[PDB]
Amino acid sequence: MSRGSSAGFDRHITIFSPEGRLYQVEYAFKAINQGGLTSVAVRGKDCAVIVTQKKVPDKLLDSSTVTHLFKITENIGCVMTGMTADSRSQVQRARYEAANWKYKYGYEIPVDMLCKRIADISQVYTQNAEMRPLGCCMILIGIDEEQGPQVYKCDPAGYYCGFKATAAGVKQTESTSFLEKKVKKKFDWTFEQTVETAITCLSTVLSIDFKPSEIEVGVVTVENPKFRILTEAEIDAHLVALAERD
Amino acid sequence: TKRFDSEKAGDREVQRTMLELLNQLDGFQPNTQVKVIAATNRVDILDPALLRSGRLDRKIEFPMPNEEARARIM
Amino acid sequence: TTIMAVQFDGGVVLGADSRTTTGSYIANRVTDKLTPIHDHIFCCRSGSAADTQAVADAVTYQLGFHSIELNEPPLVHTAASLFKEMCYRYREDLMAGIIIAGWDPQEGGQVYSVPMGGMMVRQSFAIGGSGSSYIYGYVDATYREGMTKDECLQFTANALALAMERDGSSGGVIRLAAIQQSGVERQVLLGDQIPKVTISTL
Amino acid sequence: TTIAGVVYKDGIVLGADTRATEGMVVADKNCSKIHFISPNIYCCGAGTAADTDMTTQLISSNLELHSLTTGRLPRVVTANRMLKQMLFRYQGYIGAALVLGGVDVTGPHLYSIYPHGSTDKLPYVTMGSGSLAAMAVFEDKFRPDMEEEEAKKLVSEAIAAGIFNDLGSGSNIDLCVISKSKLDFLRPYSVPNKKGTRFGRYRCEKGTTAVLTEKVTPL
Amino acid sequence: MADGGSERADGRIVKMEVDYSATVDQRLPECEKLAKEGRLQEVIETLLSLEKQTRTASDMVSTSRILVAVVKMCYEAKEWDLLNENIMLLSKRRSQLKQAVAKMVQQCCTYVEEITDLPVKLRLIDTLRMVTEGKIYVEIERARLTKTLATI
Amino acid sequence: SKMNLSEEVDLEDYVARPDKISGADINSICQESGMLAVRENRYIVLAKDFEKAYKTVIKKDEQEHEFYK
Amino acid sequence: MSSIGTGYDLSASTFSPDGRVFQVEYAMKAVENSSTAIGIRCKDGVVFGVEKLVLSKLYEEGSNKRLFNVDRHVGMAVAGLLADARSLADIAREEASNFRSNFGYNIPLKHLADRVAMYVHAYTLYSAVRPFGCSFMLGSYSVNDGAQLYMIDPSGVSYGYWGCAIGKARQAAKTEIEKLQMKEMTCRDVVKEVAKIIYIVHDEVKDKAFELELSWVGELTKGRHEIVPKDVREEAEKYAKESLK
Amino acid sequence: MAAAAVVEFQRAQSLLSTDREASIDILHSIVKRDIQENDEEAVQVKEQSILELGSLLAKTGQAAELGGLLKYVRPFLNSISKAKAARLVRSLLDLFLDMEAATGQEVELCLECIEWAKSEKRTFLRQALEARLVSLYFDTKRYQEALHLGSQLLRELKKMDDKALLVEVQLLESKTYHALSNLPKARAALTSARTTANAIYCPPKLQATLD
Amino acid sequence: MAERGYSFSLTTFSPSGKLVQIEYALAAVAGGAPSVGIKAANGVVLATEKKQKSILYDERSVHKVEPITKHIGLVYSGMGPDYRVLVHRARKLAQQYYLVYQEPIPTAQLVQRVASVMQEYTQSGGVRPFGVSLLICGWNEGRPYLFQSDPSGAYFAWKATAMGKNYVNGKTFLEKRYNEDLELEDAIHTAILTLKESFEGQMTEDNIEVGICNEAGFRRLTPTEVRDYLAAIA
Amino acid sequence: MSVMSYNGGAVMAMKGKNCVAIAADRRFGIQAQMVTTDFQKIFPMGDRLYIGLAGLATDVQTVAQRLKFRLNLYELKEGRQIKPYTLMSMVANLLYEKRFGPYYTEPVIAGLDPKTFKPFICSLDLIGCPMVTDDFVVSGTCSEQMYGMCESLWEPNMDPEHLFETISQAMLNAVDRDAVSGMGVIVHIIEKDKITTRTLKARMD
Amino acid sequence: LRPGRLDRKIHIDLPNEQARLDILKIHAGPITKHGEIDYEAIVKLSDGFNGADLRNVCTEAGMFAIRADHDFVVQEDFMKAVRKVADSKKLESKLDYKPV
């Protein structure tokens, strides 16, 4: 046998393969690519930024309540990349846990506590053969109190890790390697500077070339205690500067 | 049905014919002179290389007869 | 305990709050702040014993927090005052906690509520509360009128709290006054070097 | 019973306490530490009934540990307040613990006094145990309500020394616990106000007042 | 392009800048006049704006117009310094494609040769540098300029 | 070495990132770099052209960025 | 694939190397089989137009109806299998009823839609149960949250639409919406439009025969989800018939 | 104690500016403070100092100044007792060796270093240090002193052959026996170096010197 | 929200008499990052590779090297998600123990607790075992301790052990380089060398994490301190 | 180990410290309240057989609690070689008692023990709801714990001989049975050493 | 698969929003129609479109004109077409996943 374990069960249910790691788990990372969404997140010292498509496909779909930037809670917000069905499901579960934490535990929620908490849950889903390793990936922004602005991304596999720069989506590998060159030729991060880096990476990689109504940018700022979308006004001012950049 | 990666065999009389069939649909030779009326029981079995929208243009589903349709058949 | 009051403003609310909650001689809370929020839509002023108010205060905070983030546009205030009702229905022969809720929601527009320790919820113009902060009956009636002017409302609230702290024992120390508009709460702190002192009761 | 205070100063937090831990007004033990050191970041003063206070600090310490490690934020005193309020409610308002939680966040140093009530109480500067008002009353008196760190540290130590003098229940060494969020300096002898008289002379006796008829080691 | 990015080349092929290159070329007799007085700032700001696009076409209209003023710049031993900075700067950024610029620069090198003896030798070295990098017309111009330096 | 080079181009970063790429992979990236230089119209190959090449044609520098387990 | 005894259509915990879930997809093809249900957001309400399938000759009104009231001011139009729709009606109505009790204000559609979607989505994840074989719209009017239209599919997505169609004709029917300015428009005029779209889209092989049911929830009903009057139905029917000729 | 980054920088600026003569007073201070591990945890303060002491000797090489630094390090090497300890010794002998201020200082220093490596420090370190002592004598052309030491070097260090360092001692020794005209000894020692060289843990350069 | 779970036989014995799942789990840990643990008998040192192959990872608080409690730590090799739940779980047991005793949980005691978890995952169906090998360290009750727990639910005692890629060579390099009755400094030096003998090549201080364990506690050193060490080793 | 109430089943422990050793005396009686008819049945348990904890008062709660604790002690003892310290047991006892509600187990503990096999001595006494106290002076424990501590602090030279101590502590017991009424007759001394258990039988009234 | 026979790996990947815009104009060019500005509608709606799908919508729209009884394509017919083909392709089975 070749071309998947069809005489075997290993992509049918969750159990380790003869090769070590599961077919199914690897396959979950392939479900992200289906969403059509690519997110680029850039970590700064002024804000931690997310740039994602506002993009609507008709007159019939809202854009006054359809967004992939989500306010988990005031300080910490996130973007979901991949399957839309799984996307909402994690957001609500995250929202309830965030209120419950704040109420009982009394601690303000950094980037790590939401990220790590979801990640452990998404391990249980991967571990059960009833549930499936997630169809979405969550990239969080939020201000860590000791570190400063932080960008984390948690895997549908159930791993969390910190990132100075990250990308998730259809072109996961292409955008991260592109952004790697930008880190290497380092930018002293101002407000405008983190936002600029994120949009140039995504514009080159998709090769659409975005304008301000087509993207929506999410910041969690050090003077904003709440999560805010920058919308078109600030984006256009940066956008022109991008053409003049290089 | 081309999902091949088949590290062991996988026939491939069938592979050659699957590729040749695409070639004839492509406009190296006309496709305005040859039309294809294709009948297959499922599209689940079939691979997207074949289906497309410039190999098979219309996708017409056939549901099982309605109530009025069976009276007409009789 | 604390003199808490809220009088209905232009289309929003003006608040007043004291700063001590006393259990007889021993101060349960030497410092009490009843100006802080419990969501950005609703604020409440909490009266009665220290433990009875605090437990109610943390649940309405949790439920309210989940509701604004889950919905996507914030919830309304009418929800906040019902959450407090539920709790009191259980505790209506044991505890009591007399919460008077006011702010403004954006979505349906301004609200002033009183949720009681027996469980009820009803709309009022101005309610002032606590056990020994019921001694301003004349003062609240003469001061509140239907759509009172914002400048008048500010003076009347500070003035009513003063009459309280002097006359009732339970009250005392820094009056925390808050004037609220549609999305913003602005607090001023009025000295406890200032108090108007009661005139010839002997 | 116990005399505990912790303070918010212009530096960090200074906790002051008398030694003695009493089961009521009588000493169970005349040794150890009333102010307890927990993890590196959290220090807690204890006051009122002994039985209720030690155990509350200990249970919350596990919860706080889980929250610190996962979140990777330093402990917040408001956070600490909520955990004690929720735990003590779970128990059903049994026993008397006036508890002094004090931890340094990334912002200022923050100090809270939680009485057994299960309140959300924000002090300014507080002292606990005994009567909550009675201990709290001192803070308004000696502190001008902010002075330099060194001056404040002599001030707390002096005010706590007066409560030791006035109330003989507290006995032995006065300990000062200077608490940061990784530095816990436990100074046993800030002031020793009182100590005993030497137990030099025996009350021992030879066997002729009680004797022994065995000396064996069982297997 | 395939330098790493392509957002300047392909992705936005029309820009504010390309259009600017066209309007400023008409304005050139005045622009040249300002350059003669000095106005080191005035000429450079427009040159940079025009050449932040890596298409051969936009670069060709902008490159043509700057060249004429440059002869004066080479003559005066305070001006000439300014011109050099654009060629080295465009190259470093995300490139601008060497072919379009290379034809105009060739003629810049010819100009520095005959002015004066001594300060020309310093200027010659610098101008010879601007030419070096092409695989195009420049190779001969490069060899010839070195030969001039050699003779002195 | 076979190609003519710029003095901007530094090899060291690129090699450091993987622990090894195959023989056939060294040859391709260099061949790609050399071609890329033609587009630019420059005989000398630059740090930008070379870097792009190292990453491309063999591809997949990172496959544990989300795919860690 | 479709004929198999392990995974694929047995499971939905399964993934293909593409990433697909076939069972969740088979549930989508199921909503497609029956006629169209459209629901159009106005800045003042929602108007529905539903084909109500006539499966016999001994019909009475409300028989096999697809119009449900989730809340007092929410209507729900379903398309696809009615078996799955009845269970979905109970779950949605229940989440709304408790909401009204606790919060004491009109359920925000954005909240209700998130909760039912989570429930559908819990089944699509699972290989332990199949997922619902219908797709539904919830549509509502309130002055505490405005006029809202939401749509939930067999996958477990909730996103707001300003005009939606579910059922066989939806790709054709949706096109007719882009033609209409419906975001700003009285609920009285929009009833005339939902009725004419349905009459033209219907053909005798999507389903044998239908009974026209339109519903109000807008300025006209004063924020109540009710069925349209005999008068309203007939004029909207008439305009559908006149446009059909 | 109070050395922090500032004093380390100051000493560095001092050397850069004028020379060694200004830096001795400061230098004496950094080494003495290092006996603990300076302020707090080891951090960049310790890194900067350890790096600074290795690189310091052999710029303007020879002088009385180079000697002054040598006294200060003698209490320091023992006192550190970490993984980084290993690093002070290996660096400081190698640079000092490159530009020999003189024979006495180097021989005596090296000896102390060996004694410390031999008891309660790793085997790995010992092999670098021993190569310096043999190399010095050979350069000096005191064959006799190198030949005596040579016997111990062979026996002790032999436990590790999975290392480049062992190859080095054996090569240095073969050059010295050759000069004496102890010809069987030089020949035997030369094969012995090549046997230990076979290991594929040896880097290209070690192989080049071996040929 | 309707499920009973499935428990099925791929977790029962094959005819060979060995368990089908355990062999595969051991394969997952072999593919992992190399990890050495050395008991000095002057403290326990644990070293792992910091890297994840892109160094666009912030890791100044996210580490592979995590303290469980005041002086016991885990270092892992193998799977990242599975480790994350095991880190979290291990802490929870530590604090439970902390409530009752006042001392933090011994390495000997802790492994058995963790072992039950590994066991549930193998023996019941509809799950699969964790593919993470653990090096558990502590210094408590007057002796420093090193334990191994492999993914099956076995725990083995070693005084020097190597894991991951070239687990075999690490054990032999440890046997050779490290001898008994050497100090802590020597131990720290040898671990970075075992990691050199176990995936070779270029090292930066963001490609390695080193953490030292004493009764003072387990701490993972800062990037600078690790840098000084690098220069020492070949 | 632990029990319910304080003298409602007799039992009184007093300890004097010797440089080498700790001496502990307790009556060896048993039966509820005043009556102390029977004399064969234990209250002190061993938690390493060189460390002991004793809880003192009612026998029912004594045997039920002591045995249920022993199961958990034992599992820890076998698992980790280094059998649990003095310090570990005092804290374990505090947490185990507070945990109950029904039939509240309030012991007044006397821990009598040098730590492990090592020759470092400890004596401690705890309160009714028995929060832990570290001390290395002298300990008396029972309903009237404070009376036995006072007197235990006053009697020694500083640290008399172990030999001298069995005789002192036996006399300490004999005076105390007269001060209460909930116990009396028969006295057992366990000199607890770092490598041995010397059991001595003191003279009874 | 390994380079030295396939050194250059060029992938002719799925054409962008901008790419579809210019290609539809050319496609629009032999089409007899009332008018077409609908390019913008067509691109926004298009999801996963490749070159074959692009030519298809233009044919599918012209086919609806024949039902209408017009040799001129309605604006309604392009909009109808994109949605329909989009729906059929995704629902049945999605494209092949392979290295990009």
Mark K51-89 as b/e (b = at least 16 C-beta within 10 Å): bebbbbbbbbbbebbeeeeeeebbbbbbbbbbbbbbbbb
**Candidates K80, K84, K94; nearest CB to G18:** K94
End-to-end CA distance of chain C: 26
Is D156 within 8 Å of D11 (Cβ atoms)?
A: no
Tokens of G226: 């009710």
d(C-alpha C201, C-alpha H119), whole Å: 93
Question: If you write DSSP's letter for every residue of chain G in order, what string do you get?
Answer: --S-SSSTTS-SS---SS---HHHHHHHHHHHSSPPEEEEE-SS-EEEEEEEEE-SSS--TTTT--EEEEETTEEEEEEE-HHHHHHHHHHHHHHHHHHHHHH-SPPPHHHHHHHHHHHHHHHHH-SSSPPPSEEEEEEE--SSS--EEEEE-TT--EEEBSEEEESTTHHHHHHHHHHS--SSS-HHHHHHHHHHHHHHH--TTT-SEEEEEEEEESTTTTS--EEPPHHHHHHHHHHHHHHH-
Residue G13, Cβ density class (10 Å: 0-12 exposed, 13-18 middle, ≥19 buried): buried
Give the residue from chain F lying closest to K100, CA to CA.
F59
d(C-alpha A156, C-alpha A133), whole Å: 6
**Candidates F59, F61, F69; nearest CB to A159:** F69
Is F13 within 8 Å of E102 (Cβ atoms)?
A: no
d(C-alpha A13, C-alpha A127), whole Å: 10
Q: Starting from the edge strand earliest in sequence, which strands make up the sheet with I72-78, in order?
A: I65-69, I72-78, I132-140, I143-149, I155-156
Bridge partner list, J22: J17, J192
Check if D119 contacts A (Cβ < 8 Å).
no
The alpha-carbon gap from D107 to the nearest alpha carbon of chain A, in Å, equals 9
- The technique by which this structure was obtained is cryo-EM
Best residue of E3, E7, E47 to probe chain A, by most A CBs closer than 10 Å: E7
**Candidates J95, J160, J198; nearest CB to D215:** J198
d(C-alpha G19, C-alpha D28), whole Å: 68
Q: Hey, what amino acid is at G240?
A: A
Is G135 within 8 Å of G155 (Cβ atoms)?
A: no
- The sign of the torsion formed by the CA atoms of E122, E125, E128, E132 equals negative
Cα-based angle G116, G120, G126 (whole degrees, multiple of 5): 145
The alpha-carbon gap from A89 to the nearest alpha carbon of chain C, in Å, equals 11
Cα-to-chain-centroid distance, residue J182: 17
Q: Starting from the edge strand earliest in sequence, which strands make up the sheet with J44-46, in order?
A: J44-46, J52-54, J110-114, J121-125
Is I38 within 8 Å of I145 (Cβ atoms)?
A: no
Residue H113 gets which letter from DSSP?
H
Give the residue from chain K lying closest to G30, CA to CA.
K91
d(C-alpha A105, C-alpha A101), whole Å: 5
Is E130 within 8 Å of E108 (Cβ atoms)?
A: yes
d(C-alpha A195, C-alpha A47), whole Å: 9
Looking only at the bridges linking them, the beta strands covering A165-169 and A38-43 are antiparallel
Element (H, E) at D149: helix D149-166
d(C-alpha D116, C-alpha C50), whole Å: 11
Q: 3-class SS at J53?
A: strand
Give the residue from C172, K11, J189, I131 showing the smallest Cα distance to A25. Answer: I131
What domains are there in chain D, each with its CATH number? 1-197 (3.60.20.10)
Check if B6 contacts A (Cβ < 8 Å).
yes
- This structure's resolution (Å) is 11.8
d(C-alpha G142, C-alpha G108), whole Å: 9
d(C-alpha E140, C-alpha E130), whole Å: 14
Tokens of H175: 């050059």
E6 with A204: Cβ contact below 8 A: yes
D212 with J170: Cβ contact below 8 A: yes
d(C-alpha G91, C-alpha E42), whole Å: 72
What domains are there in chain A, each with its CATH number? 2-245 (3.60.20.10)
Span J2-205 CATH architecture:
4-Layer Sandwich (3.60)
Task: State the angle between helix axes of A191-206 and A172-184 in degrees (0 to 180), rounded to the nearest 10.
Answer: 140
Give the residue from D16, D39, D38 showing the smallest Cα distance to D142. Answer: D16
**Residue partners of C190: CB distance under 8 A and separation at least 6:** C158, C174, C175, C176, C177
Best residue of C30, C55, C91 to probe chain D, by most D CBs closer than 10 Å: C30
Which residues in chain F have their CB less than 8 angstroms from residue A25's CB?
69
Is D16 within 8 Å of D190 (Cβ atoms)?
A: yes
Is H75 within 8 Å of H38 (Cβ atoms)?
A: no
A243 with E8: Cβ contact below 8 A: yes
Cα-to-chain-centroid distance, residue G197: 15
Cα-to-chain-centroid distance, residue C144: 16
Which residues in chain E have their CB less than 8 angstroms from residue F46's CB?
95
Spans of all domains in chain J: 2-205
d(C-alpha B42, C-alpha G194), whole Å: 34
Question: What length does chain F have?
Answer: 69
The alpha-carbon gap from A145 to the nearest alpha carbon of chain D, in Å, equals 6
d(C-alpha E144, C-alpha H95), whole Å: 49
The alpha-carbon gap from K59 to the nearest alpha carbon of chain G, in Å, equals 17
Tokens of I160: 């020097």
Give the alpha-carbon dihedral of I198, I201, I204, I208, to 10 degrees.
-10
Tell me, yes or no, whether chains G and D touch by having 3 or more C-beta pairs under 8 A: no
d(C-alpha G8, C-alpha G132), whole Å: 17
Tokens of A55: 């993009």
Tokens of I5: 């779970």
Which residues in chain G have their CB less than 8 angstroms from residue I8's CB?
none
Check if F47 contacts A (Cβ < 8 Å).
no
d(C-alpha J84, C-alpha J93), whole Å: 13
Give the alpha-carbon dihedral of B5, B6, B10, B15, to 10 degrees.
20
**Candidates J137, J155, J158; nearest CB to D203:** J155
Best residue of C66, C67, C70, C71 to probe chain A, by most A CBs closer than 10 Å: C66
Bridge partner list, G118: none
Tokens of D131: 């009567």
d(C-alpha A29, C-alpha I159), whole Å: 39
The alpha-carbon gap from G155 to the nearest alpha carbon of chain A, in Å, equals 6
**Residue partners of K55: CB distance under 8 A and separation at least 6:** B54, K27
Tokens of I102: 């006042």
Bridge partner list, I209: I48
Which residues in chain E have their CB less than 8 angstroms from residue F8's CB?
92
Is A146 within 8 Å of D106 (Cβ atoms)?
A: yes
Tokens of C90: 């259980």
A166 with F13: Cβ contact below 8 A: no
Element (H, E) at I134: strand I132-140
The alpha-carbon gap from I188 to the nearest alpha carbon of chain H, in Å, equals 6
Check if G129 contacts I (Cβ < 8 Å).
yes
Q: Starting from the edge strand earliest in sequence, which strands make up the sheet with C98-103, in order?
A: C44-47, C98-103, C111-115, C121-123
d(C-alpha K27, C-alpha K58), whole Å: 7
Residue K28 gets which letter from DSSP?
H
Element (H, E) at A183: helix A172-184
Q: Hey, what amino acid is at G3?
A: S
The long-range contacts involving D54-60, CB below 8 angstroms and separated by at least 24 positions, are: D54/J94, D54/J131, D54/J132, D55/J94, D55/J95, D55/J98, D55/J131, D56/D84, D56/D87, D56/D88, D56/D97, D56/D99, D57/D99, D58/I99, D58/J95, D59/D87, D59/I99, D60/D84, D60/D87
Tell me, yes or no, whether chains I and A touch by having 3 or more C-beta pairs under 8 A: yes
**Candidates I21, I62, I128; nearest CB to A162:** I62
Tell me, yes or no, whether chains C and D touch by having 3 or more C-beta pairs under 8 A: yes
Give the residue from chain D lying closest to C57, CA to CA.
D120
Element (H, E) at A195: helix A191-206
Tell me, yes or no, whether chains J and F touch by having 3 or more C-beta pairs under 8 A: no
The alpha-carbon gap from F66 to the nearest alpha carbon of chain E, in Å, equals 23
Looking only at the bridges linking them, the beta strands covering G226-227 and G67-71 are unpaired
Tokens of A147: 């570190």
d(C-alpha D11, C-alpha E49), whole Å: 55
d(C-alpha G161, C-alpha G149), whole Å: 6
d(C-alpha A94, C-alpha A96), whole Å: 6
The domain in which residue C27 lies consists of: 1-202
- Give the per-residue SS3 of C83-111: HHHHHHHHCCCCCCCEEEEEECCCCCCCE
The alpha-carbon gap from A215 to the nearest alpha carbon of chain K, in Å, equals 14
**Residue partners of I3: CB distance under 8 A and separation at least 6:** A130, G126, G128, G129
List, in sequence order, the alpha helices (H) in chain B. Answer: 14-25, 48-51, 67-73
d(C-alpha C73, C-alpha H201), whole Å: 65
**Residue partners of H152: CB distance under 8 A and separation at least 6:** none
What domains are there in chain I, each with its CATH number? 4-232 (3.60.20.10)
Please tell me the total count of domains within chain C: 1
d(C-alpha D76, C-alpha C44), whole Å: 24
Residue G97, Cβ density class (10 Å: 0-12 exposed, 13-18 middle, ≥19 buried): middle
State the chains in contact with G (3 or more Cβ–Cβ pairs under 8 Å).
Answer: A, B, C, I, K
Residue A79 backbone phi and psi in degrees, to 5: -130, 145
Check if J158 contacts D (Cβ < 8 Å).
yes
Tokens of C40: 């950005």
Is C6 within 8 Å of C112 (Cβ atoms)?
A: yes
Residue C52 backbone phi and psi in degrees, to 5: -65, -45
Around Cβ K35, how many Cβ atoms within 10 Å?
A: 10
Tokens of A94: 């995250």
CB pairs under 8 A between A and B: 12
Is C139 within 8 Å of C74 (Cβ atoms)?
A: no
Give the residue from I73, I85, I67, I75 showing the smallest Cα distance to I129. Answer: I85
**Residue partners of E5: CB distance under 8 A and separation at least 6:** A200, A204, A246, E94
d(C-alpha A81, C-alpha A38), whole Å: 7
Residue A208, Cβ density class (10 Å: 0-12 exposed, 13-18 middle, ≥19 buried): middle
Residue I17 backbone phi and psi in degrees, to 5: 105, 0
What domains are there in chain G, each with its CATH number? 7-245 (3.60.20.10)
Q: 3-class SS at D5?
A: strand
Which residues in chain D have their CB less than 8 angstroms from residue J129's CB?
23, 51
Bridge partner list, I138: I72, I145
**Candidates K83, K93, K94; nearest CB to G175:** K83
Best residue of A76, A107, A111, A117 to probe chain D, by most D CBs closer than 10 Å: A107
Give the alpha-carbon dihedral of A184, A187, A191, A193, to 10 degrees.
-80
State the chains in contact with J (3 or more Cβ–Cβ pairs under 8 Å).
Answer: D, I
Q: Can you list the positions of beta strands (E) in chain J?
A: 13-17, 22-27, 44-46, 52-54, 110-114, 121-125, 140-141, 187-192, 197-202
d(C-alpha A122, C-alpha A133), whole Å: 7
A207 with K94: Cβ contact below 8 A: no
Catalytic machinery residues of C: 1
**Candidates B42, B44, B66; nearest CB to G208:** B66
Tokens of G243: 């446009």
E52 with A244: Cβ contact below 8 A: yes
Which residues in chain B have their CB less than 8 angstroms from residue G17's CB?
3
Is A42 within 8 Å of I155 (Cβ atoms)?
A: no
The alpha-carbon gap from F10 to the nearest alpha carbon of chain K, in Å, equals 23
Q: Hey, what amino acid is at E125?
A: I
d(C-alpha I164, C-alpha I195), whole Å: 10
Task: State the angle between helix axes of E98-113 and E138-151 in degrees (0 to 180), rounded to the nearest 10.
Answer: 20
B5 with A1: Cβ contact below 8 A: no
**Residue partners of A105: CB distance under 8 A and separation at least 6:** D63, D67, D79, D82, D83
Question: What length does chain J have?
Answer: 205
Residue A147 gets which letter from DSSP?
T
Q: Measuring CA to CA, how many Å separate J15 from each of D34, D207, H121, J125? A: 24, 18, 49, 9
d(C-alpha K13, C-alpha A133), whole Å: 28
C82 with G108: Cβ contact below 8 A: no
| CATH at residue C77 | 3.60.20.10
